[PDB]
Swiss-Prot record:
Family: Belongs to the resistance-nodulation-cell division (RND) (TC 2.A.6) family. MmpL subfamily.
TM region(s), chain numbering: 15-35, 197-217, 218-238, 241-261, 291-311, 318-338, 376-396, 542-562, 566-586, 605-625, 653-673, 678-698
Protein name per UniProt: Trehalose monomycolate exporter MmpL3
One cellular-component annotation, GO: cell tip
Variant or mutagenesis effect after changing residue 612 to L: Binds to SQ109, AU1235, ICA38 and rimonabant with a dissociation constant (Kd) value similar to wild-type
Residue numbers of the full-length protein present here: 1 to 752 of 1013
Applied uses, from the record: This protein is a target of small molecules which can be validated by developed assays that measure the topology of trehalose monomycolate (TMM) in the inner membrane of mycobacterial spheroplasts after which they may be developed to future antituberculosis drugs. Designing improved inhibitors against this protein could be achieved by avoiding direct contacts with the identified residues that can mutate to confer drug resistance.
GO terms (BP aspect): cell wall biogenesis; cell wall organization; mycolate cell wall layer assembly; mycolic acid biosynthetic process; phospholipid transport; regulation of membrane potential; response to antibiotic; response to xenobiotic stimulus
Phenotype when changing residue 326 to T: Increases resistance to BM212 with 4-fold increase in minimal inhibitory concentration (MIC) to BM212 in liquid and solid media
Anything else known: Binds antitubercular compounds N-(4,4-dimethylcyclohexyl)-4,6-difluoro-1H-indole-2-carboxamide (NITD-349) and 1-((2,3-dihydrobenzo[b][1,4]dioxin-6-yl) methyl)-6',7'-dihydrospiro[piperidine-4,4'-thieno[3,2-c]pyran] (SPIRO) with Kd values of 0.05 uM and 0.8 uM, respectively.
Impact when changing residue 679 to T: Binds to SQ109 with a dissociation constant (Kd) value similar to wild-type
Organism: Mycolicibacterium smegmatis (strain ATCC 700084 / mc(2)155)
Mutation effect (residue 660 to V): Binds to SQ109, AU1235, ICA38 and rimonabant with a dissociation constant (Kd) value similar to wild-type
Residues flagged as site, Part of the proton transportation network: 565, 621
Length: 726
């Protein structure tokens, strides 16, 4: 099978590179337009009750457009907000902005439209000492995606009204700033990471042709994966965050796969085999490991499909479509591309821009004997430090998307927090009570006052009027909503957003008036319903994740003790990495150094970081142990097999982890916080596997385990062979 494709990729090697580089570059120009056909929704549970409350409340009442954009106006030269020459100037300029964009802006509403008003809520749009006043600029669009693209059309000219000084805040000035970090991070990876991965790719192969062939494989994968994600958008939507997690994870692993196929080809050439022999022998060993590695990532990422978050579903498609395409490109393009030029992998050399590898192979031979000869002295201090690193995980707070995902010194984050200080009380996240009747009959004003009465039993709901009768005010209705007599929602905020987990349960516990069914929604209910759905399905994901990666390793290796030693070791790296991230992102240790603000972690990010760490650390255990397993099949003792595998791999795995840490290191400088969280989640897990796990834990435990490392029952070794994996 793998042996068959060894020479089959050589008999037709010219077509194999011809069609595959054509599809990747073909799908590359198609995937250019992915940046347009991509959404931003998918963080809340689309099937929960709070979403139904939020979707029903938008049909009956009106979709809230007041919170789209808020601009804070300030008169120059310490003038107060009563100057008629300034009001006649900036109102003339705002009307000019709306007149120039009648398709994007519906019009602006503010205290400046009626300077001599009596409406209290329009009077609160101007502060006490004057000097400051804000407006609301509602925007056009059906879904949350049109409104953003409409905001980014008017934002340039809108920014120039007062002269240059308007603090644009609200939903869209933040959403444009949050999604705008993707351009910053990916550009940072182009100018500062893709050069650094060219140094590492060269300081492991010594030649131009050798160093550049993984970059060709990595480049085609991105060009190929963006085409498939562009095609997926033609049916179900794909999220904004799915594009970085290809540039981030896929680009770094596609080169890694290209680093073992090019290297094992160079190894079999240095042993004396001909070109067709090595091409036939790499795909039975390295090509077999690359394919097994890719299927282990898919095994780790598909349990995320059990989660209802759309944003997580779009990402696992980006992870599968960039990893499986990275393995295919390796035993296809890179197999043929190496078969075409043969030994000319080492032709070009450094000058067109052995003794160092043997002293490197020698150093790795020395260290493992030190570990094998005294195993418990290494396997015991490491065991406790790792368990000690899982202590901070007990402080796991889960919060929602907010303005504090930017650096604390950000332009828009300060424009937003300035708004909350100047005009308190306008920004609210109430819990809505979407009560509907199946009769299609008007809810009596008594039932409303009766449902409002039961809602008044729960303590901790903001009563700012100092009057328990002006609470649970009916939600204001816009013209765009058609009011069925059956649906009438009431809503009131909370005193502490931490109580939301508690009071949403009490609001559902309130016995509704007879005939009516009350959906509890609001953004605090949208969050606490998405948090709970994660933890109900996280155990089932954990089970499917562990049994699939372990079985896939038993087929990759030949044993059953190594697939369990791996999972035990791979659960240790998970516990330590998430403990540190909780410690440095929830408890904020090291925030001022990286410019972030400590805050609760986003709930779906917890599910993604698990499936990405486990499944990347496991791919490194297959990278390493598969060489020890191959040495055992040549008739070598356990300590001889351990020493041989880990020594002939200490430069490929060390060079592979640098390419991945350079790309992920170019994303730790993200202005978006949860990208820093994921980027650090890679380095901490990655650096822990390539040093503490590879060099000290797996040799000491495999030495302790001895000749039991390779054992597997009789019938199980037959199943692995009958699947053509012998």
């Amino acid at each position: 099978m793998f042996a068959w494709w060894g020479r089959t990729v050589y008999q037709f090697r010219y077509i194999v590179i011809g069609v595959m580089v054509a599809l990747c570059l073909g799908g590359g120009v198609y995937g250019i337009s992915l940046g347009n056909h991509v959404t931003q929704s998918g963080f809340y549970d689309e099937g929960s009750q709070s979403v139904a409350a939020s979707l029903i409340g938008d049909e009956v009442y009106g979709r809230d457009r007041t919170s789209h954009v808020v601009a804070i106006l300030t008169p120059p030269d310490d003038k107060k907000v009563t100057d008629k020459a300034w009001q006649k100037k900036v109102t003339e300029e705002l009307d000019q902005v709306v007149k120039d964009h009648e398709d994007q802006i519906v019009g602006w509403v503010g205290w400046l439209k009626a300077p001599d008003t009596t409406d209290p809520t329009v009077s609160a749009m101007k502060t006490q000492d004057l000097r400051h006043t804000f407006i609301s600029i509602p925007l056009q669009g059906d879904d949350d995606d049109e409104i953003l693209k409409n905001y980014q059309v008017v934002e340039p000219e809108l920014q120039q009204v007062n002269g240059g000084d308007i603090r644009l805040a609200g939903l869209n000035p933040l959403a444009s700033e949050l999604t705008g970090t993707i351009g910053e991070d990916q550009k940072r990876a182009e100018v500062a990471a893709i050069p650094l991965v060219a140094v590492v790719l060269f300081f492991v192969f010594g030649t131009v042709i050798a160093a550049a062939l993984p970059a060709i494989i990595g480049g085609l994968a991105i060009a190929g994966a963006l085409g498939i994600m562009r095609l997926v958008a033609e049916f179900t939507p794909v999220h904004f965050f799915a594009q970085p997690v290809v540039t981030l994870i896929g680009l770094g692993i596609a080169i890694d796969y290209g680093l073992f196929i090019v290297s094992r080809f160079r190894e079999e050439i240095a042993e004396g085999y001909d070109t067709e022999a090595a091409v036939r022998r790499t795909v039975m060993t390295s090509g077999r490991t690359v394919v097994f590695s890719a299927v282990i990532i898919v095994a780790s990422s598909v349990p995320l499909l059990l989660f209802p978050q759309g944003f997580l579903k779009s990402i696992t498609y980006a992870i599968i479509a960039s990893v499986m395409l990275a393995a295919i490109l390796s035993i296809t393009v890179l197999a043929a591309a190496l078969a075409i030029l043969g030994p000319r992998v080492d032709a070009l050399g450094v000058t067109t821009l052995k003794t160092r590898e043997e002293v490197e192979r020698g150093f790795w031979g020395r260290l493992v004997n030190v570990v094998m000869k005294r195993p418990i002295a290494f396997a015991a201090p490491i065991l406790v430090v790792m368990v000690l690193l899982i202590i901070p995980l007990g402080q796991l707070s889960l919060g929602g998307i907010s303005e504090k995902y930017l650096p604390p010194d950000n332009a828009v984050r300060q424009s937003q927090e300035q708004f909350d200080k100047l005009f308190p009380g306008f920004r609210t996240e109430p819990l809505t009570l979407v009560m509907k009747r199946e009769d299609g009959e008007p809810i009596t004003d008594a039932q409303i006052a009766d449902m409002r009465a039961k809602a008044l039993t729960v303590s901790g709901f903001t009563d700012p009027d100092n009057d328990p009768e002006k609470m649970w005010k009916e939600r204001p209705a816009n013209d765009s909503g058609s009011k069925d007599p059956s649906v009438r929602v009431i809503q009131n905020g909370l005193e502490n957003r931490n109580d939301a987990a508690k009071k949403i349960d009490e609001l559902r516990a309130l016995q509704p008036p007879h005939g009516i069914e009350v959906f509890v929604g609001g953004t605090p209910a949208l969050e606490q319903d998405s948090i709970h759905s994660l933890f109900d399905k996280l155990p089932l994901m954990a089970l499917i994740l562990i049994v699939t990666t372990t079985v896939l390793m038993f087929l990759a290796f030949g044993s059953v003790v190594l697939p369990i030693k791996a999972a035990l070791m791979s659960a240790l790296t998970l516990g330590s990495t998430m403990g540190i991230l909780t410690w440095m992102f929830v408890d904020g240790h090291g925030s001022g150094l990286m410019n972030y603000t400590p805050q609760p972690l986003m709930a779906p990010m917890i599910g993604l970081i698990i499936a990405v760490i486990w499944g990347l650390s496991t791919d490194y255990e297959v990278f390493l142990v598969s060489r020890m397993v191959e040495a055992r099949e040549r008739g070598m003792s356990t300590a001889e097999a351990i020493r041989i595998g880990t020594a002939t791999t200490g430069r490929l795995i060390t060079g592979a982890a640098l390419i991945l840490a350079v790309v992920a290191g170019a994303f730790v400088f993200s202005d978006l916080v949860m990208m820093k969280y994921l980027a650090f989640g890679l380095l901490i897990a990655l650096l822990l596997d390539a040093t503490i796990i590879r060099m000290f834990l797996v040799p000491a435990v495999m030495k302790l385990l001895g000749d039991d490392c390779w054992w597997a029952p009789r019938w199980m070794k037959r199943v692995q062979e009958k699947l053509g994996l012998g």
